[PDB]
Amino acid sequence: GLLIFKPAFPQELEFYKAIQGDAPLCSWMPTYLGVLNESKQYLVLENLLYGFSKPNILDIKLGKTLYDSKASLEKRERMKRVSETTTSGSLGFRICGMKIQKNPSVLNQLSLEYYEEEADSDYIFINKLYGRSRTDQNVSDAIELYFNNPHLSDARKHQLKKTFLKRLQLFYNTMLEEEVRMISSSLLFIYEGDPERWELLNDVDKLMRDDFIDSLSSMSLIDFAHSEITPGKGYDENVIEGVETLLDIFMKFLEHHH
Ligand SMILES: [Ca+2]
């Protein structure tokens, strides 16, 4: 599963084509490889899950404003409602979903309405209703829940929080330099839930993802159907505000853990 096939939206295709010592934006994105035709067209992308044994996935939507210019006022109105009623409008980001290995301690406290199990795996899908119902006060706990893998020691969970903080510092620095406007893009977090793989790699976790063409965790930026390059227009303040909040949250994870 080296590759992903995503239905092509012309604006997302144009964004990948336009893009592809602070890191450049492209280094956060999946590698775009081309298109496949059916006709139905698909974007062919690097699979960000490739190489993980038990990937644990967190999708976060970036921005207070959640519509672009091309939006019909019907969806413009729907998107203002989403922003106004979730952490998007207050904090600049919201949890969109997760797919994580179930932790018995977690499952006991989480409402049945917030997730979908299966018999065929140890994985739960944490749904949109969960992410939309997070408040400014409990959203930090929701992120700590993501990391609460039953197979990882407290030392490894902490390492990951620290590594992702560093990625957020680097991503913030990238965003100060990029002249783009990105609407409803996601940061995609992935970490390795299999501690045999932590053994194999001796707990060494690359800050930046290996260039695909020529990791125990990764942070990526995905979903560019409402993105475009905007040279001369300055940095994306809308997105950076969400990043600023994530930085505060992740720095707080490190408090008290001397
Ligand atoms: Ca080893």
Curated annotation (Swiss-Prot):
Function in brief: Inositol phosphate kinase with both monophosphoinositol and diphosphoinositol polyphosphate synthase activities. Able to phosphorylate inositol 1,4,5-trisphosphate (Ins(1,4,5)P3) on both the carbon-3 and carbon-6 positions to synthesize inositol 1,3,4,5-tetrakisphosphate (Ins(1,3,4,5)P4) and inositol 1,4,5,6-tetrakisphosphate (Ins(1,4,5,6)P4), and then to subsequently phosphorylate and convert either isomer of InsP4 to inositol 1,3,4,5,6-pentakisphosphate (Ins(1,3,4,5,6)P5).
Binding site for ATP: K6, E46, N47, L48, D59, D223
InterPro entries registered for this protein in UniProt: IPK, IPK_sf
UniProt-recorded name of the protein: Inositol polyphosphate multikinase
Protein origin, superkingdom: Eukaryota
Named cofactor requirement(s): Ca(2+)
Positions of substrate binding: P55, N56, I57, L58, D59, I60, K61, L62, G63
Keyword Zinc-finger set for record: no
